[PDB]
Symmetry: C2
Subunit: 51 residues, 2 copies
Amino acid sequence: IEPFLKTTPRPIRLPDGPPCFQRSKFLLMDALKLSIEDPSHEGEGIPLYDA
Amino acid sequence: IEPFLKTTPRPIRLPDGPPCFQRSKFLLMDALKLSIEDPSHEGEGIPLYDA
């Protein structure tokens, strides 16, 4: 055994190399949405036509 | 000539026979309308689907 001392754990070094790049299937902050402006309640829609 | 006197013109006699019957292409007082409840302004509709 050893004393897992206060000053012992060094800061974990992150890898270095090229910059990290996004891989999400859909962007998250920069996206925006073209509203429909509140259709009726009985009118169902096959989604293409609403789009 | 003759004097078209005040008392001369008898009341025109309407014909007599069976009762008069409607022939309009669409009834007029008794009809009613199933509303759509105010759709949007951009959504055009081929009329069957609105009906």
